Amino acid sequence: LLKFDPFGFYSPKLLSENRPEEAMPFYEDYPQNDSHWNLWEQFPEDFEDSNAEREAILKSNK
């Protein structure tokens, strides 16, 4: 219990939730709160999302 600290306020929390071990895949830790009342991903208003890479490659190809 003393070590237990899922959030990073008292014990620092890696952005990568866990440290992967050899012979195992890298999976996110199960969150403490598993509520599924989540919206679709939100983006800033007037967010630029044009496929610049594809446009540049097509322009180069001509």
Added chain:
Amino acid sequence: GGFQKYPIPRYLHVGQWIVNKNWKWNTFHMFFPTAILCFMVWRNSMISTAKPPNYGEYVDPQSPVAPKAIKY
């Protein structure tokens, strides 16, 4: 006298041996607003308070304040 102190987990929101540095200002900002709320409640309730007559006062039976029976 008391029990020996033991570690309490940081993540757990419990009151074991909790002491706040800013307790003075916390008390100041928790007492006076509560006093004002109670003052408002008190002045609201005083409108519906009843007291018996004073030492030198008698209730006139025919005065409106005197109790009145139902008239069928």
Added chain:
Amino acid sequence: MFNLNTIYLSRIFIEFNFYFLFFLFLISSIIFYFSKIISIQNLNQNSVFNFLKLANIFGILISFFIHIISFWFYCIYSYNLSLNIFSDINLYNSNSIELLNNSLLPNYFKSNITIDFFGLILLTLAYIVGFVSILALDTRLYWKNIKYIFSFTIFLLIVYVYVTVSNILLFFMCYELLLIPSFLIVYFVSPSRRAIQASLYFVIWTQLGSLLVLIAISYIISITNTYEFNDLKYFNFTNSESTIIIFLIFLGFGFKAPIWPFHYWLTKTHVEAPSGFSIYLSGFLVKTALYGFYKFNTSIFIDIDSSIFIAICIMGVVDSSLKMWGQTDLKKLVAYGTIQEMNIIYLAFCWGDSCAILGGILFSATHAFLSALMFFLVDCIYRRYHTRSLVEVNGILHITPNLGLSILFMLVFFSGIPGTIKFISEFYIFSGLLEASPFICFILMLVANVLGLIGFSKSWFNATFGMPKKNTKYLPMDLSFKESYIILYCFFFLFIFSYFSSIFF
């Protein structure tokens, strides 16, 4: 100062809230069906399941707000209608005001809407309990049962037509429609393997009573060809027909609203059903039966002694209260509490259309909220501690203080402290029963509020207190904001509904 504007606003709001819900459901269903070839979740952030969850939640919530407004309009309308009828005494004058329907939307099923206080209370219970249960079932719906996100919207539409119709046949059909969605939820959403048998028990036990009510409806319709629910004033049933109808109606609706001995299905289903659907079942689905029983028995004239029915209700109360002690399973204990409260409510309806109906309605509301609170607490305990048994769970307060506090305050509210609609309903029922049969009232109060209360409190106190030394690596953290605010809202309603206008109570 009452004017026709309020009348038409009330009628328009009541009529249009139903179509608001129906259009929301229709659009959501069209999107769900035509967005994917196979109607199952795509396990990615861009799934339509998020949109459907959003649409269902905030259609129910916005319709609940509109229902608040429409219910207030109805209260004003009914009060002023009674005043208009009562006030004028001149023989030449008579209140004959005729309203013309709007030209925008049609009347669903070509029926003119009629609304009553009990029906709107039932509809409000539907909204709130459905909101709580849908919030609960998020963790249960996953990748093949997402189609059941619309179950509560379907329930709301069925209940809306059920409470806003003056037709006996439509009334009965709406009552009988509730079986399929509930059975499907229990069958496909329940984690436990015993839910498969629990669903069959639920179906058979409820369908026996449904057949009884169907026989009663057939008796009424075949004898009286009317269906308007008000032409029964001009037709009188003989003594034999009336006694048969009341017996069939009482037994059939008591199969649904659990009465002794017909609560085996309820216990099984509550134990083995989803924790989120148990809330909806206990809170609402057992009170449609009470509403239907009230309507039918107040419409029919009955010249029989109700002692047998009162005895059945009191026996159910006594049985549930005595059995409360022997349950180490919190969910089964709450189920027995639900049986007790429902039997008391049903007893409140055993004197025809007397003043007992007011206490019955208030007790139905308080029981809905209290059962929702209790089942939600059991849900939280089971989800964070992976067990809902008293032997495996102990010392909840010392690891999850908020959950323990919620349990303690739930017990206090269940005890029936003054300042709560629970206390008000108990006061109504016991005040009537004291004059009806004082010794029976004493026995009922003693049993329910001492023996059953002690049995109920033993398990909850033992779970809340103690010392959780076992499995220290797996202990949970605390309630979430969602759970905390749900508990707070239940407490807030139970406390503040006592200030509702006393005209209707």
Added chain:
Amino acid sequence: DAYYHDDTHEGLMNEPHGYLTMDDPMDLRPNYEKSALELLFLVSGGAILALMLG
């Protein structure tokens, strides 16, 4: 007392700590359950104030 230890020096005196709820303070999910319940509370309170009180 004989050997009382001051708070500034006692290493086991706790200052206010712990997480109020189980929600992660730094969560990237666009979760709306809390907002929905807060909206329900606020609208109920507003309806009482603007339709029923008085």
Added chain:
Amino acid sequence: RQNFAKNITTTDIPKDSHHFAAKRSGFTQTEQAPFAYNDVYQYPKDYKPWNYNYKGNGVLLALFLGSAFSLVAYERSYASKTGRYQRKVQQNYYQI
């Protein structure tokens, strides 16, 4: 399980990249490879996990405006019930 995307674009996640450092020299033949991502969450100073950390006046203003609207609405309603354009305050009010 959870399928939402961690890397949001509405704002940049607070982080500290100095708490954990990855070894890049002096390895042995038995030591495991280091880790690529070593950033940790950094909370804003003065953040108190034991309360709501709410510093906005929106809720208070909304509640106060609702109460004020309720007061004025009740005033108008009482005037209408008494059949007057405005309340007729009496010269003396007694307990009741």
Added chain:
Amino acid sequence: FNSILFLLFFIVNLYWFNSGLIFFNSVYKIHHDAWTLIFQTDSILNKLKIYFFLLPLYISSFIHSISTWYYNYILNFLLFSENLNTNTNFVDYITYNTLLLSKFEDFNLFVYIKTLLITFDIRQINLDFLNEYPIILLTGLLFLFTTIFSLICLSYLGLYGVFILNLASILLFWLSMLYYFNLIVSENYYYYISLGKWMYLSNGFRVSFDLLIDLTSISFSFLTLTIGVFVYIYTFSYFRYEPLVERLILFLNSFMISMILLVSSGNFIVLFLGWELIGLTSFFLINFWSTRVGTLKAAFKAFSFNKLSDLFLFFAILIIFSTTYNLDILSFNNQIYLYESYNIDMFYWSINLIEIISFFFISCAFIKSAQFGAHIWLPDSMEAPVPASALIHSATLVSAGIYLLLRLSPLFELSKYAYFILPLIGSVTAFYGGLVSAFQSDTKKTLAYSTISHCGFLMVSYSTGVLEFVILYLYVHGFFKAATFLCVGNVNRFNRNIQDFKRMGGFYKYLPFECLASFVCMINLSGLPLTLGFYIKHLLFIGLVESYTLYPLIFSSLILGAIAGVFYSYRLFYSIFFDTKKGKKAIYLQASRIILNSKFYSNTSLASNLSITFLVLISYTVILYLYCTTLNNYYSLSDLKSIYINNAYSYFYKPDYNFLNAVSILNWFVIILLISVIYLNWRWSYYYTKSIDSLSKFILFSFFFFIFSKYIL
């Protein structure tokens, strides 16, 4: 952009505006309707002069007109109502209202500012205003809200914050209660306050949340609050260095406020609310050690008994409501006599209405007062911490039945069941508790059984029917029981939570203050000659009735219970303090180290000692005040609102030789028992022969001293 320039300009504008207001007021008085003839004169020069010299008035009027226009627009927008009185255009409205200056006719800036300043002036508040309107409510709400908010916000208020906040609130509450205690008890002041229409309880009924601050209410309220103040001050030392001191303090405050609400209840609904609240908070206090399940068993025992009492009280209230369509306490008290003749048709018997109602009330009262049979929970309730035990057992939890009887006395005066049951059960409980306490070996158990005995005596006093005697007994018992509980709590804390005095010995030196405080408190508690606590038992025996059928058993039990006080007091005091050292060697050695010798040395808390001292002083003063009010030749107690006169005061004012000599029997019984507990040897000692010799000397000297005093002078 200079602050000094802004302030100077503002001051100049204020002076100019005030001068213009005075000038306009004078001109308006002179020219009530003709002022316009000169103000709005067509002459351009005069118009310019007026505008220039009344610019502050004109600008103020323009601002007022704009504000009024916007306010009217807002009201119309919000309420869909009417227009701005009329449909005046913006330009016409603003010009008209700005030109109009009659709005300043009665307005003076200096007068208005002075009125605003004097509005908050506190010099004005007077005793007469306080007497007209009770400030007890303001302070009680302060205490209640402080406790609730402190419970909710524990992290904000640390140990010190919680202590100081609740201390301030409780001190203010106690001071206000003390101020009103004098008026209510003697000056015939009582208040009936109503907060609002609480709930609807029938088709058209609605009970209001009302409080009744009468003599009956204040007698319990002031006692509970006075005991609670010092228990609160003492708790911070008793629970010193404990993980959870704030929780205990807040539980104590919660129980205090619950009991205060119960005692000062205006109707049966508020009474029932307070009943359930004291039950719940007592449960929490008993179950304070939530980690242990052994404590939970005692808590659950108390909870079950409390729920049974709640059932009885609820059923009685339902019967009252069914009979009379009213729940007001005063109305019920003044109406019950009309319905006395009524009966209730139950299952197969026709029970008298008064008898059944009084039966349920007495049952609940016995359960909550721990009478014989229903007292089983009280010994187990001692698992609570000593402050909680003292508060519950002194005047808070165990006096609820006494309060019920005192408040509903008009009902029980016409109750055959009450007449038969109160004296018998009271005397049996008195005897049982006294003897068990005498034979007890644990301090808290001894105090609990003594509390049971004193509750039995209170029941018997109420049976005698002198409410003044009942109140005096209640006050004496509560104060001294609380003080003794605090003393034994200090003793137990020193002895390391071992409450049995078989492991206590020679504590007089280690706890000097506790020894002397316990001596005083115990001699007062156990009714002993030449002490403040002798008169309560004397008055009880004065008032005891003799028409009972079971009078032999009642009187014998009363005598045995009364004498039993001496044994338990002596055993507790002597065994704790002056007996041979029986405790573990560590208890004494850890405190006998020379390093500890200091001006600060003590085994208790200075705050605890001061709290106990002040409690004893205030208890003495209050008991003396009550004795003067009631037992004096001039009767100055306030009205009790009861028309039943018992004639018991006749044997207090003009006792006869028969009764005067009868009391001597009990006096000499107590004397012989004192001699036994003092001079009786149970163990061999070096002082056996000298002890017998001292007894002989005392007997002979007593005889000779009596001879000289009576005859030889």
Added chain:
Amino acid sequence: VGSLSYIFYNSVGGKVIRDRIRASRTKAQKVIVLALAFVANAAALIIARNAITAHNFGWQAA
């Protein structure tokens, strides 16, 4: 409108994330985020209250 605006504005993430987003939020954007939901809900409630309150009665006199 009010419900959806409130949800979308106050459903961006945890407390820290929401606070940082609102801090980076422009002045006018903050004003709308605070005012839109309240204004919509309040207007709805006021329109509801208007119907029950029959102020527009011609008998107002005396």
